[PDB]
Amino acid sequence: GQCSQNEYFDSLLHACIPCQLRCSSNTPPLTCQRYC
Amino acid sequence: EIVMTQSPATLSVSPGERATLSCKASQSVESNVAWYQQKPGQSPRALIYSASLRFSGIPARFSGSGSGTEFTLTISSLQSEDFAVYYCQQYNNYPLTFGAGTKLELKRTVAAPSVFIFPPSDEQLKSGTASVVCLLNNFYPREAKVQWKVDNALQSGNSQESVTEQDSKDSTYSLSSTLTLSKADYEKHKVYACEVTHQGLSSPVTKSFNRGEA
Ligand SMILES: *[C@@H]1O[C@H](CO)[C@@H](O[C@@H]2O[C@H](CO)[C@@H](O)[C@H](O)[C@H]2NC(C)=O)[C@H](O)[C@H]1NC(C)=O
Ligand SMILES: [Cu+2]
């Protein structure tokens, strides 16, 4: 997908998920290493 | 394909306690793992996506964790509503793949079974088949040994059995063991017994009937 740098694509829901949701996780997505 | 390995396949936890499920993948799937709940008859129910994010309406009870190749689902304080089969899924690589599933059993106190035996009916004998059913009603834990004795001789390989899900209120099991003989073979013997072994019984319980007892 063509999401914004402030998001990452989840292929289960086929949508752009804001990186903020997983920023406070033990390991945010490898493409969300900036927003946090 | 990728393999999702869930452990344990079963888990006996009483309401109010915690359950921790394990899901291990054969390849790294980053954080692209979901969890599902499925109850008998019902279709699956999405719980978690992206390893730790819950779907709409999923209580904080359920908490997903992990990343890479080892994943976990933790249920903080079990309620009766939560006992079911739990699957993990990876969607990092196509095709999407599920695991064998973990079955949450409801732990309760020991309950001994009530045993009953049913001779074959006269209607089934005309057809040419004889089915001898032995019923175990209301018991816990599941583990139970039910042996058949024809003319006080121990049988082997001629009986199938099926069990019910835990009761909605009792949380107990009910098991049936059906001995399938032919009318010809069923009349070569007279005494048909059913021996039951369970933790709730200090010694095995045996119920029998003689061909023509009634
Ligand atoms: C199927 O749908 C996709 C996604 O909407 C279409 O791709 C879009 O195409 C339009 C016009 O070309 C663009 O404005 C969008 O930005 C495109 N989306 C993406 C993600 O590239 C696609 O054209 C459709 N396919 C058809 C009509 O055959
Ligand atoms: Cu019953």
Author numbering:
A (entry chain A): 6 to 41
B (entry chain L): 1 to 214
Authors' own words:
One of the most attractive targets for both antibody and chimaeric antigen receptor T-cell (CAR-T)-based treatments is the B-cell maturation antigen (BCMA). This cell surface receptor is involved in the survival of long-lived PCs in the bone marrow via interactions with its native soluble ligands APRIL and BAFF. Although a number of monoclonal IgGs have been generated against BCMA, only one has been thoroughly structurally characterized, the chimaeric mouse/human J22.9-xi that showed substantial anti-tumor effects in an MM mouse model. Having shown promise in retarding tumor growth in mice, it was desirable to generate fully humanized J22.9-xi variants for eventual testing in MM patients.
We noted that a D54N substitution in the hVH CDR2 would produce a eukaryotic N-linked glycosylation signal sequence (consensus sequence N–X–S/T, where X is any amino acid except proline; in J22.9-H, the D54N substitution produces N-S–S) and, since the CDR2 loop does not extensively contact BCMA, we introduced the D54N substitution into J22.9-FSY. With the resulting variant, referred to as J22.9-FNY, we also obtained diffracting crystals. We solved all three structures by molecular replacement: J22.9-H and J22.9-ISY to 3.1 Å and J22.9-FNY to 2.7 Å, thereby allowing comparison of the binding interaction of the fully humanized and optimized IgGs with that of the original chimaeric and biologically active J22.9-xi. The structure further allowed testing of the flexibility of the VH CDR2 by the generation of a glycosylation signal sequence. Using the PTM modification D54N, we induced an N-linked glycosylation of VH CDR2 and solved the structure of this variant, J22.9-FNY, bound to BCMA. The J22.9-FNY structure also shows retention of the important binding interactions between BCMA and IgG and only minor shifts in the backbone positions of the CDR loops despite the large NAG modification of VH CDR2. Comparison with the structure of the fully humanized J22.9-H again demonstrated the retention of the BCMA:IgG binding mode despite this large substitution in the immediate vicinity. These observations thereby indicate a site for further modification of the antibody, for example, the addition of detection labels/tracers, toxins, etc., that would have certainly remained undetected in the absence of a structure. The fully humanized J22.9-H showed a 13.3° difference to J22.9-xi, with an elbow angle of 160.5°; the CDR optimized variants displayed no further change in elbow angle, with J22.9-FNY at 159.4° and J22.9-ISY at 160.4°.
